[PDB]
Design a protein around this nucleic acid. Structure first.
Length: 270
DNA sequence: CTTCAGCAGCACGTAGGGGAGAATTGG
RNA sequence: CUUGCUCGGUUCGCCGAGACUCCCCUACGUGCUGCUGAAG
DNA sequence: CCAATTC
């Protein structure tokens, strides 16, 4: 499932300092800096509601308003898996060591030599873990957050979305887009590729396909032309679609990147 | 004024941990 | 094939050819940098 | 009709 990365036109607030992102951040730090005896003790995370009011009241991790189970269930499953990773890799390293350690023990029978000294075991911590990872700012969107067409929500159509650029050679001279008479015999004219600085050398907003993804009193309005463009080069659909139809191809659950100011979508299984 | 010594990264690889739903059932 | 990214052409009017499995983290590498200790 | 529940 390749991603269909789409830009952000406007946002209520940067993705940072956002209920889901901020509350996730607090969860992240607690889990990673835990003890192997405080992981199986402070972590009792259940896919229910009263347990996440129990886990968030026993671990002490704060919530500035986020209680949504569908988004507080993968957040608390990301951190625990990530912390599990930092012990898994060490165990695999130790396991790899004992895989060849048995292998060099097999050659001892042919060697007729004294057995090799025991291979040391790498310990993930010698109570806090050695490698406490940094927080993952990526924001994950769930079913109650899934995208919808922008149909005033605080210019879009779910009418059939325009094909766009229907006229190239018929533009009047002097108007934006006319092929010069000397080179007369699909990127729009405001494409930054054609006006970039080179060794020899609002329109986007007014010709947009705005979708919207909402999290409580928050929202992101991605430009679906990026989502449009993903379909048109893979061989899935044709010019006949709408704000409702394209979102059908792409997973209900998109991802978000606060830093680059870009959101990420994924193809569904089909 | 040269060998190397071992930490760090502006920048680079690899190498290895984590992640990228959605259909029902309550109030 | 409406946005966005890379690299080219031009009369600067936009034109030509492409990429698209990405993201997060820990850490370890190469010149470079720095801090030191050997030999005249 | 919108959060909590399921695998």
């Amino acid at each position: 499932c390749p991603p269909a990365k789409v830009n952000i036109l406007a946002q209520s607030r940067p993705l940072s300092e956002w209920p889901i992102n901020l509350v996730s951040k607090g969860v992240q730090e607690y889990v990673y800096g835990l003890t192997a005896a405080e992981r199986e003790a402070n972590g009792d995370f259940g896919t229910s509601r009263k347990s996440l009011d129990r886990w968030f009241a026993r671990t002490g991790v704060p919530t500035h308003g986020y209680t949504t189970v569908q988004g507080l269930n993968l957040i608390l499953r990301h951190t625990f898996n990530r912390y599990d990773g930092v012990i898994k890799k060490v165990e695999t390293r130790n396991e790899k060591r004992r895989s060849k350690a048995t292998r060099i023990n097999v050659s001892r029978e042919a060697d007729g030599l004294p057995p090799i000294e025991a291979e040391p075991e790498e310990t993930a911590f010698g109570g806090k873990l050695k490698e406490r990872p940094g927080i993952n700012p990526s924001i994950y969107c769930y079913q109650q957050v899934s995208p919808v067409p922008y149909n005033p929500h605080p210019s879009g159509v779910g009418a059939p979305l325009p094909l766009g650029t229907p006229n190239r050679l018929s533009i009047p001279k002097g108007q934006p887009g006319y092929v010069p008479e000397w080179q007369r015999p699909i990127r729009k004219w405001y494409a930054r590729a054609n006006w970039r600085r080179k060794p020899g050398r609002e329109a986007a907003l007014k010709e947009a396909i705005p979708i919207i993804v909402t999290i409580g009193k928050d929202w992101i309005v991605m430009d679906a032309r990026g989502l449009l463009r993903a379909v048109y080069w893979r061989g899935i659909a044709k010019p006949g679609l709408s704000l409702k139809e394209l979102l059908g191809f792409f997973s209900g659950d998109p991802v978000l990147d606060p830093k680059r100011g870009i959101a990420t979508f994924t193809f569904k299984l089909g």
